[PDB]
Design a protein around this ligand. Structure first.
Ligand code: 4GK
Ligand code: 4GK
Ligand code: MG
Ligand code: MG
Ligand code: ZN
Ligand code: ZN
Lengths: 317, 322
């Protein structure tokens, strides 16, 4: 209980007071500060007197305990996703309700809690007890379950000054928000919102339209490494493949063949895999997000910049 | 026909190209995919850089473009993206052969390409015929293609949509004949006729470009290299567009099955397994021979052949397990 004492004390350096507000900030070389960076983003965006520092700090360090030393789905990725949602909300400061803004920063930070570095596919094919438990969106539901568990620990419950509803409300925002980071649901989500933007039936007074927009915002954040500056971006993909290939290897060890994406032998097709992933997933995501919320546009511009870079890699420039 | 709203052409006018595309848009394998908002503006940039800045009055152009866009459907392959993709390819062929073609052919070839699949229902020349469609009653060879051009004229004739405003009546009836011929020749059923003669005209040193009927033949083949240029893009783009081609076909195959009739394999989703061999078969029967004869006639277009070879190997790899 002295981890969360060395967190109450943190002051974000003035030199980062601007850098952080930029959509393309790389938290990468600020390891020590990451839990202080998140304290900063919460305060700036939700208020200094909405979470009682201690309970907030208690929370954050515990969440941090509960992320494993995997190559990609780690503490560095929680913060990075949290950061991006900060940037989204800051640039849209009016659309989102007090209760949402708090939920979403929290939901982002726990969204991959206690990941083991295994896809849902993997968990389900090998009848692992988490697949036994949640047939669909397997990891995502554990993540949430794990959010619930850290909160119910002594003195971690940061929502203890809220109505019955108000408490069951925010968690629900978090539930739906964490679930939405199952990428298999993203495709549906995005196609509904597209038809709803063309048609024009899109209504932000409708709470199930709110859900889909928040949904998409979670994908955008989750995927946000494709929006960083190219060296960060290049590097963070290496970490992605390292997670996948360790899952690929684990499959070989079982006399079973992994897919190419998970096949380190296939290192070479990486750039074309990225280009494929940008055209099929990333770009449409940031494209529709921008349609819905215009200020999010530097997300799409940077995504286009990295797509070019991946093209150049493939073509030899 | 359908009018386009006011606001549509007014933003189109204010639009400006990013300095990094100006570089990439000139290149053959350039993919327009990730710049949807920019497409109608990519057309202007393209027109202007090919046919001049006062070729047409922006206002009239922009109206036409936006009304060309809205007369495309949300079908899977033959849509607004495909039209601009085909226009982009023309542009890049023109640019590499810029003085081989009259100012008047480049205006008309770029519009033709923009308009060459207007109001595609999502159906083939065989379906419409076989099932005695109105359109099939109206036009009985090159069915949709004829309709595509009928559709162009209709868009030409609309208060403010006529971009051949300032043309002599003579030149007006000329650019309409470049366009007609260009569009019809996108009927792939004709390509095989066209390519054999061109191939023949090539092996004898008798092809001549100031010979008009040889000109039209060359133009038609340009229209084919453009219609198929998705096979010249980088692999992950080629594969993704293949998905959309098949989405459309299989949607048609599904209609036939309903109607009491068995689709050809290409249109039957139950036959996916042979996709690679359909691709392999199409690259050898159709596309490779397209870009080979194109590069013999217009050697700067060669990067189209090289990229077509690149993706032919990819389908071959896809084939052998890999
Ligand atoms: C989930 C996610 N987030 C961010 C990023 C930048 N990525 N990149 C991916 C993987 C994209 C991908 N790579 C391949 C691939 C690579 C080498 C050989 N074969 C491959 C086949 C499919 C791939 N995909 C979808 N997933 C993600
Ligand atoms: C009209 C067009 N333009 C571009 C491209 C890359 N394509 N590719 C096609 C389909 C080519 C094709 N597919 C099959 C096929 C597919 C599954 C099963 N059997 C098949 C038999 C022949 C096929 N062909 C020619 N049409 C096009
Ligand atoms: Mg996750
Ligand atoms: Mg056509
Ligand atoms: Zn994540
Ligand atoms: Zn076409």
């Amino acid at each position: 209980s002295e981890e969360w004492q060395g967190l109450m004390q943190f002051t974000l350096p003035v030199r980062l007071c601007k850098e952080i507000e930029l959509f393309h900030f790389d938290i990468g070389p600020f390891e020590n500060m990451w839990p202080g960076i998140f304290v900063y983003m919460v305060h700036r965006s939700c208020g200094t007197s909405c979470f009682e520092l201690e309970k907030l700090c208690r929370f954050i360090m515990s969440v941090k305990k509960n992320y494993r030393r995997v190559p990609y789905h780690n503490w560095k990725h929680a913060v990075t996703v949290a950061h991006c949602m900060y940037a989204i909300l800051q640039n849209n400061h009016t659309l989102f309700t007090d209760l949402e803004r708090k939920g979403l920063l929290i939901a982002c930070l726990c969204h991959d809690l206690d990941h083991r570095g295994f896809s849902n596919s993997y968990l389900q094919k090998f009848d692992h007890p988490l697949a036994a438990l949640y047939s669909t969106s397997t990891m995502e539901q554990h993540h949430f379950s794990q959010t619930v568990s850290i909160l119910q620990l002594e003195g971690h419950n940061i929502f203890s000054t809220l109505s019955s509803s108000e408490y069951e409300q925010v968690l629900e925002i978090i539930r739906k928000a964490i679930i939405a980071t199952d990428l298999a649901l993203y495709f549906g989500n995005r196609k509904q919102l597209e038809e709803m933007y063309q048609t024009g039936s899109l209504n932000l007074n409708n709470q199930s339209h709110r859900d889909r927009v928040i949904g998409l915002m979670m994908t955008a954040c989750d995927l946000c490494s494709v929006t960083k500056l190219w060296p960060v971006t290049k590097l963070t993909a290496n970490d992605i493949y390292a997670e996948f290939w360790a899952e690929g290897d684990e499959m070989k060890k079982l006399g079973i063949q992994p897919i190419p994406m998970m096949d380190r032998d296939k290192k070479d097709e990486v750039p074309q895999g990225q280009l494929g992933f940008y055209n099929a997933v990333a770009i449409p995501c940031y494209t529709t997000l921008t349609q819905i919320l215009p200020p999010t546009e530097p997300l799409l511009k940077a995504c286009r910049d990295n797509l070019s870079q991946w093209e150049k890699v493939i073509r030899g420039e």
